[PDB]
Amino acid sequence: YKLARPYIADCPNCGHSRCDSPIAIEEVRGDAHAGVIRIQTSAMFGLKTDGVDLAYMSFMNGKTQKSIKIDNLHVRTSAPCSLVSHHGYYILAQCPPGDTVTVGFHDGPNRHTCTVAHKVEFRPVGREKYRHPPEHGVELPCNRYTHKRADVPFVPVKAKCIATLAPEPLVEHKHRTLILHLHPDHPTLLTTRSLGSDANPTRQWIERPTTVNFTVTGEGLEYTWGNHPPKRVWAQES
Amino acid sequence: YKLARPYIADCPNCGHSRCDSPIAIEEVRGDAHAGVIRIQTSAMFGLKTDGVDLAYMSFMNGKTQKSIKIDNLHVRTSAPCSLVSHHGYYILAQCPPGDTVTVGFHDGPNRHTCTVAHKVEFRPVGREKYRHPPEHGVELPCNRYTHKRADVPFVPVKAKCIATLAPEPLVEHKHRTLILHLHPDHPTLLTTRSLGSDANPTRQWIERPTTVNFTVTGEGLEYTWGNHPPKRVWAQES
Amino acid sequence: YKLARPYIADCPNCGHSRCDSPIAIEEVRGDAHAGVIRIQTSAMFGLKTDGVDLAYMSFMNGKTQKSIKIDNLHVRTSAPCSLVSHHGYYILAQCPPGDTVTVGFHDGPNRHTCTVAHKVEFRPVGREKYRHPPEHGVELPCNRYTHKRADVPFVPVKAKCIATLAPEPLVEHKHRTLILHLHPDHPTLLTTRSLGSDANPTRQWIERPTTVNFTVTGEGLEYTWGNHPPKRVWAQES
């Protein structure tokens, strides 16, 4: 169970003559290649007066610590963000980078927003760096967060998260030689090796219909064709 | 034409203010090298409850069926955008991107903004793409739409859209040689061929003050210099 | 002194198709490397009917010297902004990026708001221009302007803006030879010349850990690491 409740706070960056704001954020983790972001907020969703719900928030909105259902306390990156789960002290929403999380009041003609900057390091750790999750294609290494509560925080995880792609290479096996007729509509990191004993350590980024011939040992080869983790082919002769 | 009454449609990203919103784009059609976009909204423009008007719209709000004058309800892609013609479920407006269309009320209920990501089509003319009509001289092929108030969609129609120019080519005719001192402010496709008793199949991309010498037989040459259609001399100065 | 009367002026986008605003920005000076803006408005700020004040402005809109409080007519980016000084026909304000300034009345259904996209200009002041203020480094002289008026336009001045710094040229001394391992975190201009009998006439833009070796005669050398004016070392193992 959470040990803290929302409060009015001086924002790190808010509009001048409005910096005396309600609704604020503490820390955010966005180190994930996941589209979801784990928030430690002080403008908390997943806290009503009763604690943890999945579609309710609480805030001190220049008022007092009290709750209503999601309406006036909005997460944003700078554009809307749709929450996924609320877990008391920690909130989970998708606001992909997690370096800018904005809690803002979007009523009346005025646009009030407090935005909090965070100390996230989002780096490669996969086999390639890639686009945030869409719905389409095969995943790639990420460091997602849990998408349900346990009531205090959401836990850190490493898994694999969705990535866009285009039709996979037309492979042709022939005498000790494998041509990959490629049709990326999207930048793919192409990594190769033979899987026999031939090294072929070949990275290249490809896009557009092109061909890339590779040697084979005749004992398979891996070509990883971006937005997939290693794909491998084998045969008596490849 | 402007048959039946408006409806709502699901906004892909909206606040917690609304979501089941009016003015939620279905499609946009481009290929315009003008700043106009043809928009298909859930809400009907050019129709209020009084039937057909030219500067009023109607909308199902998902909460109310009501109409207003276009003022309080403003289209934007960052700044306000002024419509040009209404054809029921379709709007035709000046608002240059059309890739994303964000329709929001900063007067009407709460601080509503629906932003929509939806269908677009756009194409190069075959020289350089542009979407700015200035008042700089010559125009090139583009798409635009009709301004139908009666017979639902405004049909596609060819039009002429002004293109950005740059300090005009200093032509110098000389003996058997026509040097084209070119002074783009913007990337120009220089396509040439000589006229008269010669003709050169020569594409080159130009940008920044340069010279480009061409043969001429004493009978000029045509040079098309990007964002202009053919500019040709047939001089005996050559 | 200021005495150039308030006026109204057409601003490209207000309301929906509204454009009949006062308070409209005509010109901007962005000489500052900071997020402060010098604004030229049609409306006169810093003058009410009482003459010169510090927190009142005046405008026409059917008037000629009618005034309101600088909070009634409120500057904004996408959140309020508080001006700092008024120099009549010119406003100078702090508005979070200083690259988007919207002066607007969000009073009633007719919502006139003018926005001009302001700019930050970086120009040589050392031997190179420099980036916007960050956490890193310490303030240095920048291009700017006066941030208080004279009791009509604000005048240019050199003031102090936080420079992005990163490790300065890490000198490695050797036998009358200096290799300079420099480790920017930001685009820095490296200028050199020797201050020994030799000279090292080298401008180069650098980013990130690199080396640039220079000769010396055992009689010093200069490395300017742009945003500073010349830094000099003299006959160490230089």
Next chain:
Amino acid sequence: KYKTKVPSPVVKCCGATQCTSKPHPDYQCQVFTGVYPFMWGGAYCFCDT
């Protein structure tokens, strides 16, 4: 992947400030004396040096 934490600095007006070590991985402090003169300089302080 570390996160840099920059907390607000301990300023003593009219007296020296001494660093208190903390076991954070690359915790570094530095004591800077005479930071802010009389009145404004980045903090209001009566004392200079």
